[PDB]
Amino acid sequence: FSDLKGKRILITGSTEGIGMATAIELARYGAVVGLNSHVDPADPALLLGKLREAGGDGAFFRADITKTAECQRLVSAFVERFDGIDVLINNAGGLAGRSNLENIDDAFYDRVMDLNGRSVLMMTKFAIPHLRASAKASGTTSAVISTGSIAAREGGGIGAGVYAASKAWLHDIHRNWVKEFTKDSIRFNIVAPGTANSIPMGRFGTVQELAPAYVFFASHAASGYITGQILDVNGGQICP
Amino acid sequence: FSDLKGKRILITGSTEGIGMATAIELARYGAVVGLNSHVDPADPALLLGKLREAGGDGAFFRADITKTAECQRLVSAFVERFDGIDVLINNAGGLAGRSNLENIDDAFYDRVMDLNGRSVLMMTKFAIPHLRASAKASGTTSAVISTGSIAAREGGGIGAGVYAASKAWLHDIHRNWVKEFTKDSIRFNIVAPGTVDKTRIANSIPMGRFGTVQELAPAYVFFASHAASGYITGQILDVNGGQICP
Amino acid sequence: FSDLKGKRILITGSTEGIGMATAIELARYGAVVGLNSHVDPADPALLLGKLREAGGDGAFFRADITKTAECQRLVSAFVERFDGIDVLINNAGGLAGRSNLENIDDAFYDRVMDLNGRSVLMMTKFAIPHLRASAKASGTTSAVISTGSIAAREGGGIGAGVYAASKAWLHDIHRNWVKEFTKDSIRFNIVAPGTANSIPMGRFGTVQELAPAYVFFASHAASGYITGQILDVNGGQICP
Amino acid sequence: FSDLKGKRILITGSTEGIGMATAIELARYGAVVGLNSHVDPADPALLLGKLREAGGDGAFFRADITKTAECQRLVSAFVERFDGIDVLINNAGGLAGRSNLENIDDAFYDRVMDLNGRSVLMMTKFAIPHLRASAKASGTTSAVISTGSIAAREGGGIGAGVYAASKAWLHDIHRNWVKEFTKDSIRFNIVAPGTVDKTRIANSIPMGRFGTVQELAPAYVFFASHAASGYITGQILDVNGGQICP
Numbered sequence: 001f002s003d004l005k006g007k008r009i010l011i012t013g014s015t016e017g018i019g020m021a022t023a024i025e026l027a028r029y030g031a032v033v034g035l036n037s038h039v040d041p042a043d044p045a046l047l048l049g050k051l052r053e054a055g056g057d058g059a060f061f062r063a064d065i066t067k068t069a070e071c072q073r074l075v076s077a078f079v080e081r082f083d084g085i086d087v088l089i090n091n092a093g094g095l096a097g098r099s100n101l102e103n104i105d106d107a108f109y110d111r112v113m114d115l116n117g118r119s120v121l122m123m124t125k126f127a128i129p130h131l132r133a134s135a136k137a138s139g140t141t142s143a144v145i146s147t148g149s150i151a152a153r154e155g156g157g158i159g160a161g162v163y164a165a166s167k168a169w170l171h172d173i174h175r176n177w178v179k180e181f182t183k184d185s186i187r188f189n190i191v192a193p194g195t196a197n198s199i200p201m202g203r204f205g206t207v208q209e210l211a212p213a214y215v216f217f218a219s220h221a222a223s224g225y226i227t228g229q230i231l232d233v234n235g236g237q238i239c240p
Numbered sequence: 241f242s243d244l245k246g247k248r249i250l251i252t253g254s255t256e257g258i259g260m261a262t263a264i265e266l267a268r269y270g271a272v273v274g275l276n277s278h279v280d281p282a283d284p285a286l287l288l289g290k291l292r293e294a295g296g297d298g299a300f301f302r303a304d305i306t307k308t309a310e311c312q313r314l315v316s317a318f319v320e321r322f323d324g325i326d327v328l329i330n331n332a333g334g335l336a337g338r339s340n341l342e343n344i345d346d347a348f349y350d351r352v353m354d355l356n357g358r359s360v361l362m363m364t365k366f367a368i369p370h371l372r373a374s375a376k377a378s379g380t381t382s383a384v385i386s387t388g389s390i391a392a393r394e395g396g397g398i399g400a401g402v403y404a405a406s407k408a409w410l411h412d413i414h415r416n417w418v419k420e421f422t423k424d425s426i427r428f429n430i431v432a433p434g435t436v437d438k439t440r441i442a443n444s445i446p447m448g449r450f451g452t453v454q455e456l457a458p459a460y461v462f463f464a465s466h467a468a469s470g471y472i473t474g475q476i477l478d479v480n481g482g483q484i485c486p
Numbered sequence: 487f488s489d490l491k492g493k494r495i496l497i498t499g500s501t502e503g504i505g506m507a508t509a510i511e512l513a514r515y516g517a518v519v520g521l522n523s524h525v526d527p528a529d530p531a532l533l534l535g536k537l538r539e540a541g542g543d544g545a546f547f548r549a550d551i552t553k554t555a556e557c558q559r560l561v562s563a564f565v566e567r568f569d570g571i572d573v574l575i576n577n578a579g580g581l582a583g584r585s586n587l588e589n590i591d592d593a594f595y596d597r598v599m600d601l602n603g604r605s606v607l608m609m610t611k612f613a614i615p616h617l618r619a620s621a622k623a624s625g626t627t628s629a630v631i632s633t634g635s636i637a638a639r640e641g642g643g644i645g646a647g648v649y650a651a652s653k654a655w656l657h658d659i660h661r662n663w664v665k666e667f668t669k670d671s672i673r674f675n676i677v678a679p680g681t682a683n684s685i686p687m688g689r690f691g692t693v694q695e696l697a698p699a700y701v702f703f704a705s706h707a708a709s710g711y712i713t714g715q716i717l718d719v720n721g722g723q724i725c726p
Numbered sequence: 727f728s729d730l731k732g733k734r735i736l737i738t739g740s741t742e743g744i745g746m747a748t749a750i751e752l753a754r755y756g757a758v759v760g761l762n763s764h765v766d767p768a769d770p771a772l773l774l775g776k777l778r779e780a781g782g783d784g785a786f787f788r789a790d791i792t793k794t795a796e797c798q799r800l801v802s803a804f805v806e807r808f809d810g811i812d813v814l815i816n817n818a819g820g821l822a823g824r825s826n827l828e829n830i831d832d833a834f835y836d837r838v839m840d841l842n843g844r845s846v847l848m849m850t851k852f853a854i855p856h857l858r859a860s861a862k863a864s865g866t867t868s869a870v871i872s873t874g875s876i877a878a879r880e881g882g883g884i885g886a887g888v889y890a891a892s893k894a895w896l897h898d899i900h901r902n903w904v905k906e907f908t909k910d911s912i913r914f915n916i917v918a919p920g921t922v923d924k925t926r927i928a929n930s931i932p933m934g935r936f937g938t939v940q941e942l943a944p945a946y947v948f949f950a951s952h953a954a955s956g957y958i959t960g961q962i963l964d965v966n967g968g969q970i971c972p
Contacts, residue, residue, distance in 0.1 A: 228971030
C-alpha cells in the first residue's frame with residue numbers, strides 16, 4: 001500500500017469506532033486524513049497525534065452531515081486545507097434509535113434517512129469533481145468507500161427496519177454510481193460490518209478487524225480493477 | 241383462486257398501468273378492489289364499471305400518499321367503506337424525474353424518497369392493524385404486495401440512482417417486516433418489474449421486448465391468494481423477460 | 487390457467503411428494519402429465535386415476551435418470567405417447583445420503599451429482615428440440631421448471647454440502663439456458679423449497695403449498711414474460 | 727502483511743496466469759509457496775528463482791488434480807516438504823471447452839465438473855486436516871481461498887453453462903464449509919474474477935478493459951493474511967472492473 005503516501009482521505013464520522021481505527025490504519029501508510037464528527041471530540045490534538053505517530057497527517061473538521069449545506073461546507077473546508085480529495089470514506093451513520101413499524105412517525109423516518117441516506121448522497125455529490133480531478137492528475141483512480149451493513153441484506157433487527165433499508169439503499173446507489181462515474185476513473189466499494197451464537201466465529205468483530213478492508217479499497221495498487229463491490233466483515237454471520 | 245372472492249384489496253396507484261390491470265384481474269375472481277390515485281381520474285364510474293363487468297366490485301379513493309396524513313386518510317376511507325383490509329398492494333411509486341448525481345439537490349432526493357419510501361412505509365404502517373384483524377378473523381393469512389424493480393438489484397439507469405436505491409430500500413424493508421409481522425399471519429411479497437410499456441434496453445432483455453401490464457397482473461393475483469402462496473413470504477418475483485436473473 | 491388444457495407435461499420423480507402433488511394440481515387444469523420414478527410404484531393405475539379424477543390425463547414411465555441413456559429413453563417414450571412436450575419439470579433429486587467433508591469419496595460425489603446435476607442437464611438437453619417445436623406450434627412459449635432449494639443460497643446443512651452445491655449449480659445453469667434458449671421461446675424458472683424455529687412461519691411446508699408455484703410457472707398466460715427466476719417457498723426461512 | 731512470512735501456501739494451477747502472479751506477490755511478503763500444474767513447466771528452476779528474488783521461497787509439485795488420487799498425492803508431497811499447510815489456494819480450474827446444451831455429452835460434463843468441482847472438493851478435503859493443525863499451532867486462523875467467477879452469478883457465456891454452474895457450485899460449497907469448519911479456525915473466501923487477459927465483453931465492463939493478473943493477486947494476499955482478514959469468512963470478492971455489482 002505504498003501508493004497511499006500523501007493521499008488525501010476525507011472520512012465522515014471518524015472520531016470514534018470504525019472511522020478512527022480506519023483513519024489510523026491509513027495514516028500508517030502516509031495518508032493525510034480528514035477527521036469529522038458532528039460534535040467536537042474531547043481532545044482533537046490527540047487524534048491528530050495518533051495519525052502522525054502512525055506515519056501520516058490530518059485535521060479535524062466539525063460538521064453535521066445530516067444537513068446538505070454542512071456536507072458542502074465540509075468538502076470545501078477539506079479542499080481548502082489539502083487542495084483536493086483522493087479518497088472519500090462515507091462512514092457516518094447509525095441506527096438513530098429503535099422503533100417498531102407502528103410507532104414510526106415522520107420525525108423518526110427523517111432522522112434515520114438524513115443520517116444514513118441524505119448524508120452519503122450529498123457528501124459523495126460534493127466530492128465528485130475533486131475525485132474526478134484527483135484521478136485525472138494521478139493517471140490512476142480515485143475512490144469512494146462507504147460503510148454498509150449486514151442489515152442491507154437480511155432486513156436487520158426488529159425496530160431497525162428504516163436503518164436496514166437505508167443500508168440496502170446505499171448498497172444499490174453505489175451500483176448506480178459505478179455506471180455514471182467509472183468513466184471518470186472513480187471507484188466505489190463498500191465495507192459491510194456484521195452486528196453471537198448466530199455468528200460462525202462466535203464473537204463480534206473489533207474495529208481493528210474492520211480497518212484493513214478500507215485500506216485495501218483505498219489503494220489503487222491493491223484494488224484498482226475493483227469497483228461496485230461489497231466486502232462483508234462479519235465472522236460468517238451472512239455468507240451472501 | 242376462489243379464495244379471493246370478497247377479499248378487500250386496497251391498491252395504491254391503480255387508475256392506470258400495472259395497478260389498473262391488477263385491479264381488473266383481481267375483480268375477475270370476485271375481489272372488492274379499492275382504486276386509488278393522487279389525482280382524480282376523468283371518470284371513476286367507468287373504471288368501477290370495468291371491475292363489476294369483470295365480476296367483482298370496488299370504489300375509488302383519491303389520496304396523495306407522498307403525505308403521511310394522506311396515507312392515514314386513505315386507509316381510513318377504505319376501512320370506512322369496507323370495514324377492513326385483506327390485501328394491501330403498494331403499487332404507487334415511480335422515477336419522479338432523472339438527475340445525474342452532481343445535479344441532485346434536496347428537493348430531488350425528497351421527492352423520489354417520499355414517492356417510493358415514505359409512502360410504502362406509512363401505507364403499510366396504517367394498514368397492518370387491519371391486516372392483522374383480517375388474518376385473525378379468517379384463520380388464514382392477510383397479505384402485503386409491493387411493486388419493486390429490477391433497479392433495486394443493479395442500480396438502475398443513469399439519472400435513476402435515487403429511484404433505484406428507494407426500490408432496494410423497499411426490497412429490504414420487506415425482509416424486516418417478515419421478522420416483525422409473520423407472527424400476525426401477515427405475508428409480504430414483491431413483484432419486481434423490469435421494463436414495462438428503448439432499443440438498447442430491448443437488446444438487454446432476452447425476450448427482446450418490454451412487458452405489458454397484462455403480463456404483470458397474474459403475479460399479484462398469485463401473491464394475493466392464500467391458497468396459492470400461503471407459505472410464501474419475504475420473496476421477490478422479478479417479471480422482466482430475463483433482463484436480470486438474480 | 488385455462489391455457490394448461492391439453493398441455494403435455496413431463497415431470498421427473500413424480501410418484502411421491504412435491505412431484506405427485508404438482509402432477510395432480512396441473513391435471514386439475516386439464517394437463518396431460520407424464521409421471522416418472524426409478525422404481526415402479528405400488529399402484530400406477532391409482533396415480534393415473536387421480537390425474538383423471540382431477541380433470542387431466544397421463545401415463546407412468548419408469549426410468550433411472552441418473553443415467554443419460556435413461557434420460558434419452560424417457561423423453562423419447564413420452565414423445566412417442568403424446569407426440570411432443572410443452573413443459574418439462576425437473577423435480578427428481580435429493581440428498582442421496584449425508585457425509586461430512588472428510589468422509590466424502592468419489593462414489594458419494596458421483597451419486598449426488600448424477601442425481602441432482604447430470605439428470606437435470608440431460609433431461610433438459612433431450613427435451614429442448616421438443617420444447618422448441620411446442621412453442622413454434624402454439625405461437626406462445628414452452629417451459630422448463632426445475633426444483634431448486636434454499637440450500638443453493640446458504641450452503642445447506644452440515645453433511646449436505648455436495649447436495650447444496652448441486653442446487654446452486656442448478657440455479658445458475660438456468661441463467662445460462664435463458665441466454666441460449668429465450669430466442670426459441672422456451673422459459674426457465676425454479677421453485678425453491680425450504681427445508682422450524684429458524685422459519686418465521688414456525689412450521690415446515692406441505693406439498694400442497696408447493697404445487698401452485700409450479701402451475702404458475704407452467705402457464706404462459708400467467709408467467710409468459712417470466713424467465714430466469716427462482717421463487718422460494720419456505721415460510722420466510724430465507725428472504726433472498 | 728508481515729504475518730505472511732514463513733506461511734506455507736499451496737496454490738493449485740500456479741505456473742501461469744493468476745496463480746503465478748499470486749505466488750510471486752505472496753513471496754514478496756516472505757511466504758513459502760507450493761507451485762503446481764497438471765503438466766511440467768519447461769523450467770521450474772526459473773519460477774522458483776522468481777519466488778526467491780521476490781523475497782520468499784517454495785517448490786514445484788506436478789499433479790493432475792482432476793483425479794482424487796492426485797489431490798491426495800499433491801497434499802502429501804507439499805506436507806512432506808514443508809510439514810504442513812497454512813493456506814490452500816484452489817486456483818486450478820477453467821472452461822475446459824464450450825458447448826451449446828444440445829451438443830453436451832457425458833464426457834463434456836465430466837471434464838468440466840472434474841476440473842472445477844471434484845478437484846476443489848478433494849483438494850480442500852485433503853488439506854483441511856493440515857489447515858486445522860496449522861491454526862491450532864499458531865493460535866490464529868488458517869485459510870482456504872478459491873478462485874470463483876462472475877459466471878457463478880449470471881450464468882456465463884453461451885456454451886459455458888456447465889463451467890458457470892460449477893463456479894456457482896463452488897461459491898455455495900464454501901458456505902457449507904463455513905458451517906462445518908469455522909469451529910476449527912479455518913476461514914474460506916473466494917476471489918471471483920470477471921474477464922482477465924472481446925470488444926462486446928469490454929463494452930459490458932464499466933472500466934472498458936479486461937483485468938490483468940497483477941490486479942487479481944492483491945485480493946488473494948488480503949484473504950491469505952489473518953492480520954488483514956481474520957474476521958472475514960464465507961465471502962466472495964469480485965474483481966471485474968464493475969462487470970457485475972452483486
